[PDB]
Structures are given as C-alpha cells and as structure tokens.
Design a protein around this ligand. Structure first.
Ligand SMILES: [Mn+2]
Lengths: 219, 219, 219, 219
C-alpha cells in the first residue's frame, strides 16, 4: 500500500487540491474578519475551518510515510508541520495568540507553490552574507542601549528607562522615525548635549546600512 | 479617400498639432484652478475645452480608420481612447470624479511624444520581473492585516478595526511613517508586546524592499 | 603690461591668496552670526568684509583682462562673477535677501579649489541623464496637483487650496514626511476614498524614484 | 623572561581568555541596568568589574612589552589602550560621562575577535573615498546654516537662533524627519517663501546623498 499512497501524495492532483483549499481557507479567513459575516455564516465557516484542519493533518501524516526522515530535513516541510501543529492546539486554554497564529497557515501557499519557494529561497539565501554585519550592529545597539538607559532613563523612563525600552527607542531613531521632534529635542531641553549621542548614532547606523545594501548588491 | 487621410493622420503636422493642443489644454487646466481666473475668463476656457475635446475625438476617429485593429492592440492608442472617452462623459450625473479625471488627458503628452514613450516603457518593463516579489508581499500584507485586525481592532478600531484599515495602517508602517509615536507606542500602552508584531513586520518588509531594489539593479 | 598681469593672475601665489581670503571670510561670516561677537568686533568685520569684496572685484577684473571672451564661457568664472556681483549690491534698498545671498561667495572655495570642482562636476554631469525622468515626474506632479486642488482644496485649503499648495503637499507626501497622520488620515475623515488618490501617487513616485537611482547606478 | 611572556601573550589560551571576560563583562553591564539586580547583587558586580579592569591593564601592559613601538602603531591596540584608559579614571570627579563611556570596552569584542575586525575594516576603508563628498556637504551645510540663522533665527530661535541650532535643524531636514509639518509649514506662516530655501536644500542634499551611495556601490 506504500506505493499506492506514494502515488496519491506525489500526484499532481493531490498538490493542486491542497493549493485549492489554501486559497479557499485564505478567502475564508478574511471573511471571519467581518463581524457582519460571522453573524450570518459563522457556523458555515467554523466547521469548514475545522474540516480543512483535518485534511491538512491527514496530508501531513501521509507526506511523512512517503518521506519518513527526508521530511524532517526539509525546511518547507518542517514549516507546514509546525504551522499545522499550531492550528491543532484546541480553540482554548493557554494563550489566545495561538488562535490568532492559525492564520500563519496561509504561508503554505508559499510552501506549496513553486516560484514562491524560488523567491523566498532567493531572499533567504542573502541572509548568511549579512550575519557578520547583523552581529556587528547588534553589538552596537546593545552598547548604545546600555549608555542611553544610564544617561537618560531617570528623567526619561518612557523612552530609555529600561534596557529594552532604550533598545526600542534606538530602533525608532534608526528608522529615523520622529527621532528629532519626538525624542531628541525633548531630551535636549534637559540634556543639551544629547545631540552628541544621537547624531553619531545616526551616522554610524545609516552608514552601516548603506554598506549592507551595497554588499547585497554585490553577492 | 483612405490614403488621403492616412497621409493627413501620419503627417508630421498632424502629430505636432496634437502636441500643441495638449500643452495648450494643460496650460488651460492650471488656470481653471484659479477662482479668480474663472470669474473673468471661465467662459473662454469652457468653450476652448469643449473644442479641444471634439478635435481629439475627430483625431481618435481618424486614427482608427488609418489603423483599424492595429490600433486596439496599441497600448498607447488604447490609453488615448479611454482617456478621451472619460472626457466625453457629460459634465453631470454618476460621479464628479469623471469631471476631475478629465485632467488625465494631459498624459497624452507622454503618449504623443517619444523619449517619454521610451522612458515610460523603460520603467514599465521593469515591472514583470517584480511580480513574483509583489505577490509575495501582498500575501504577507494580507496575512498580517488579518492578524492585526483580530489582535488590535477591538481597542484600536480606527487603525485596525476593519481588514481595510489594517491594510492602510500596515502600509503606513511600511513607509515607516510615524509608525512608532503614531501607532505602536499607543498600541503598547494596552498591548505591551505589540512590538513583537511590528518590529518583525518592519524587518521583513524592509528586507524584501531592499532585495527588490537590488533585483532591479541587476535586470 | 598684459603678460605682466597674466603672470600675476596665473601665479600659484595669487590663486592661493584667494583661497586664503575665502576661508577667512567664511570664518568671519560664522562669527557675524553671534549677536555677542558683533557687539564687540562688529566694526572690525564690517570693514574686513568690504575690503575682501574689493579685492575680489579687483581679481575678477584682472581675471577678465587675462581671459576676455574665454572667461564668459567658463561655468566657474561666470559663477564667481555673479556671486561677487550679488555682494556688490549696496547694503540697502530692494530685497534683503541680497544681504543674505552674500554668503554664497563661500562657494568660491568650490570654484577656486580643484578636486571640489572635480566632485561638483562629477555630480552635475549625472543630471543630463536624468532629465527624461525629471520631465516625466514634473508632468505627473502637475497633473495630480491639479486633481488634488480640485478634489480637496475646498475643505482643505491649507493643504490643497491652491495649485502651489497642492504642489507643496504632494512634495511632502513624496518625501513620505508625515504623510498619513499628517495629511491623508485627516483627508479621509471627510473623503473616505482619498487613499485611492494617495496610495497610487505614492507607488508611482517611489517606483520612479527607485528607477532613477538605479540609472545613476549604471551610467 | 621576555620570550616566556611573549609566549604567554601570543597564546591561543590568552586571547580566548580575554574574549571570555568581555562577553562576561558585557553580560554584567546589561544587568547593572537593573535597579533590581543592583539591590540584590550590586556588590558582586562592582568588584567583578574592578577585577576585570585590573586584568585588562595587565594584558595591555603585557601586550606592550611584547610589541613596544609596533603596538602604538596598531589601530586596534591603540583603541584598547584608550578604552581601558577611560575605564581607569576613578569612579569619581570631573565629568560622569566617564563612568558611562566605560561601556565602550565592549567594543573590544570587535577588536579581539577577527572577522569583526575584517568587517569593521571593510566598512572603515570605504570612508577615504567619501571625504571629497563629505567635505562638499559640510561646506554646504555651513553655508545654509548661516543663511538660515540670519533668515529665520529672530522669529524662530529654537530652530535657527544659533549657528549650531541651525546646523541641527538642517540635519533634521536632511534626514527628512518631520521637516514639513514640524519646521517649514510653521516657518511659512511668517515667511511665505521659506519653501524656496528648503525644497532646494532638500533636492541638493538628497541628490548628493544618492551619488555617495552609488560611488560606494562601485568602489
Ligand atoms: Mn517621518
């Protein structure tokens, strides 16, 4: 029966059937957004949902027999396992993000349709050549985050009061988002020289990011 | 009479006469902006306007005899047909965007003048090689837009209340426009962890956009 | 006497004596900023200023005998001429931008010193390759500025009330500066669909802008 | 005894030992952030801290016997000396930024670990090729900063009242941060034409900046 199901799983129809359900379940998840729709077809959709969830475990179960160890060494497959897994935790208990993290299954359209995998893989592949920079930056943030917490956190605890707060604020400055009228001009009403901390922070961080982009535009 | 008009239409004079009317109508539309001007010469320019609109239908009518089916397979010609057609719909009924959309005809200066045509075409040609990325993104947006509506839309309905609103807000975050003091700092007063939703969203979307720019700097 | 002065003019000393005066007049113009400094040594630097202004006209006169027609076909010389001409208009009458435009003579440090000229020339030379795009954009801005004035200027006359106002706001939207919470979210409280005007405007303008950068990265 | 210690210093175990203390001290400084941790184990931490500072001077002392002049001609060694030196100034007196600048020793992780050195070096090396542009820009900022101080500083002293203030505001405009609703629209309520100063400022500075990115993307 192995080759029987190995012929079911590997079949064009099987895959296209899965893809058909995803786009349907995707359409169905945008409708569960509407408080109106839920009042008229909420039941239609809750069951349709639980149904598709089974079909997917069945598939994932099947795909495993047909592949065994080869499966748990496939990025894309591991993904669909964990994603379907999330959607299996009963609609209750623990955290309610789990109910919300269900919509992660629509990323299966990326997993199950080639070309996406190409582009996603294309994208991801660039990351290894960025790890040296990403490490460098995280050290830098961490250092400045520590300096800021202890230079500005007493008077400005919303923004710099905690190591993590400072991390966040520094991120915002780095995205150059309201950094001046939002953060630094206020700071300077108390700490006139704060511009000496933030202009150098901005130059470095922006410089680094240009280099990183240029590097990607080489490799 | 065909070759007679085919020699009228294809003539340098004809083409240059059209270009002359556009820059004239374009000048005339900027003046229709002034409430002052309209109170003095509004009559002049309403008639001048209907005149140019006739001339353009005549031209578009002529151009169709001279080209027949070759014409309704020309992007640039199709454009002008539609753009002129909009300007034909009476100054009444339906909506008023149709009165306003009339100004789209000044895009004929792009259509009726090469180099422009070249440049526009140069640009557009870059699009097909982005469609794989654009699909990826629109999937990503759609996924997060749904998550956001159901995680933040109850307490923050102006921003995430509806799927469409989440889309808009997510767009704004993507343009990195007032994203922190504007959206996420507020969100965190109620949902401390919202940063776990928006920082990842920012990284991915910015990464992807950098890739897409680099892709265009290859092809 | 011609070659006598042609030998003074072309002397390394002469050109270096000029460069020496620029850096002094530049140093001296930053000090004129201080309300304090002016109360002490104001009279010192008003004369020192007028002194240098003479010297530069003497030079520019000298530079003209030595070069004649050749001089008025030199960008850098024409510049130097107009920038000194501005500085001769009597500290009085007309507009007082003329008093302020005097600080443009510090751009003579760009003229008088090579490498700067190289770099400036390097930059400027990239402009002609951009004029097709720049033309395209200005047409596009013009078209939308008109739609916006007539779509939003009645209710929102600060931002769209006038063609020029619309230009400015559109520019601001193009720099992506406070565009959502600043302009469009307001606009939508009255005109729900305004997003249909601004999201497309944003795509096109950012797309084009990316293209333009990449072109400057292949030429 | 020289070669004995030259064999100690150059030892793999030595270098790794140093790298070990940095990650330990770096972890330690993040905990010194916690007002909680300090009440608990503050004592534990200040001694462990002084200990490390001892160890590091010994190393730098040792490192010097083993390299003499060669050491004070090594960028990375100079850094480590100057960094440990900052951390040597007693926990008292003068400026308290000195207590804060201590955390700069975590940059020794860049210094003591290669690949980092590589990447930093990679980055830093791009700078020389940018000094013509950086010069061009600084002259530009200086010139406009002066015009702005004298054009707007009387009515707008927070933003333009002083040369340094103007420098700051101009930088903020250059980062395109809140530049319109934050600075120029205000400005225009009094000085209708201020758009004539800031749009050109914005064009030039953004133009130059794009060039500088491309220059890097070639060299
Ligand atoms: Mn902004």
């Amino acid at each position: 029966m192995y080759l029987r199901i190995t012929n079911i799983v590997e079949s064009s129809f099987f895959t296209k059937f899965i893809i058909y359900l995803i786009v349907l379940n995707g359409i169905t998840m945008g409708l569960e957004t509407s408080k109106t729709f839920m009042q008229s077809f909420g039941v239609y959709t809750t069951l349709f949902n639980q149904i598709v969830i089974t079909i997917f475990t069945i598939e994932i179960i099947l795909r495993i027999y047909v592949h065994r160890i080869s499966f748990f060494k496939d990025p894309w497959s591991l993904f669909d396992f964990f994603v379907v897994a999330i959607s299996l935790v009963p609609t209750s208990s623990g955290f309610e993000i789990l109910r919300v993290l269900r919509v992660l299954r629509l990323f299966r359209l990326v997993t199950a349709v080639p070309q996406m995998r190409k582009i996603v893989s294309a994208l991801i592949s660039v990351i290894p050549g960025m790890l040296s920079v990403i490490a460098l930056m995280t050290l830098f943030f961490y250092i400045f985050a520590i300096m800021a917490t202890q230079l500005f956190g007493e008077r400005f605890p919303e923004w710099f009061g905690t190591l993590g707060e400072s991390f966040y604020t520094l991120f915002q400055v780095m995205t150059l988002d309201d950094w001046s009228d939002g953060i630094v001009r206020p700071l300077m009403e108390v700490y006139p020289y704060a511009w000496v901390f933030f202009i150098p922070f901005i130059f470095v961080v922006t410089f680094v990011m240009i280099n990183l982009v240029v590097a990607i535009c080489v490799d």
